[PDB]
Design a protein around this ligand. Sequence first.
Ligand SMILES: Nc1ncnc2c1ncn2[C@@H]1O[C@@H]2COP(=O)(O)O[C@H]3[C@@H](O)[C@H](n4cnc5c(N)ncnc54)O[C@@H]3COP(=O)(O)O[C@H]2[C@H]1O
Lengths: 178, 182
Amino acid sequence: NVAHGLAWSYYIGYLRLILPGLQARIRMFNQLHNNMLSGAGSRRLYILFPLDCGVPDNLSVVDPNIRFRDMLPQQNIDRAGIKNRVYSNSVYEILENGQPAGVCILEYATPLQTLFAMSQDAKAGFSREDRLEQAKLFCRTLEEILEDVPESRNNCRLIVYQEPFSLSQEVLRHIRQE
Amino acid sequence: NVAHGLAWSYYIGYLRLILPGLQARIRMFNQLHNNMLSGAGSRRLYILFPLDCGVPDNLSVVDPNIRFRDMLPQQNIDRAGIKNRVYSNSVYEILENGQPAGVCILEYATPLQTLFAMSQDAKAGFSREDRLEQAKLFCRTLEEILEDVPESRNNCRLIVYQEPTDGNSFSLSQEVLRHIRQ
Ligand SMILES: Nc1ncnc2c1ncn2[C@@H]1O[C@@H]2COP(=O)(O)O[C@H]3[C@@H](O)[C@H](n4cnc5c(N)ncnc54)O[C@@H]3COP(=O)(O)O[C@H]2[C@H]1O
């Protein structure tokens, strides 16, 4: 199942690596940028999961209420022969009525671009309904791996959504949760 | 289709991205390192494909004759929200009883690590015969995807091999040299 591969790829090749040392890179960010990620809703990685598989590379474009602030300190790992493979995250202010109402670390789940792609292939196949079906399983499979590792919930939130819808707002919702 | 998602991932999420900008970075690497990557066989990205899916992080350990030299310039891309996501590649000397035999860009196919642990997982399951079958399919799917990308053959070389369990001899560093020597 493609989705299980995508989900295991995301965990193994990324989360499992990135998640143990997030709070470390955040204590550093606060010392460096004047205690910006102070709040509890600020000390997690918010991962956007459009079930439509539509994933823009620039967030400010898509919702002008999401403004780039800085990047977390870089994290450098030897990976499968690549020396110092770089793992980098970005920090964002979210706006409400043009005011900075909250800050967080934010990105999309990259492999949904891959799912989209497979789906448009003239021989691979899928349809919108098959692709949406695989997107949900991707998400479901990712959740259930994350359970066996309670370093997840402290460190990361999944934000899942389908568009049959305010992005900067739904992000504030979760930030304000904590 | 697990291997299929993985073959599409390595391309859509990597080779699509970095193969085009590869030669610009090499020529820069040459100007900062005394024209090291001189040969046509050196100006390629060599990707190791162990069908055994045992993919260690450090090469020199797995074959003493593969020595880390330096790194290519990094390429930064805004990607799915991450600003300046970094794409980095490493350069290697390949030794032959202490004599520098060839020099290239070299790495493993990272997703092989994913099949490995997937197989080991208690519930995700599948055996060593099933993982081997999926690793093969990965390569095959990858290679057919790449047909529509004529730049690729001038930029990267897939090096597929299974390691011996029968006692036979296999030299990885030799294998890389053969490919370079093409
Ligand atoms: N440094 C990072 N920063 C932020 N997110 C990250 C990340 N590394 C990984 N991810 C997430 O991990 C997914 C799979 O990572 P993976 O490393 O196993 O497997 C990767 C890897 O095999 C190859 N690859 C991708 N990016 C690479 C890179 N920057 N350097 C070397 N190889 C890379 O592409 C495969 C799939 O790439 P893909 O990007 O689509 O998808 C990545 C991405 O979704």
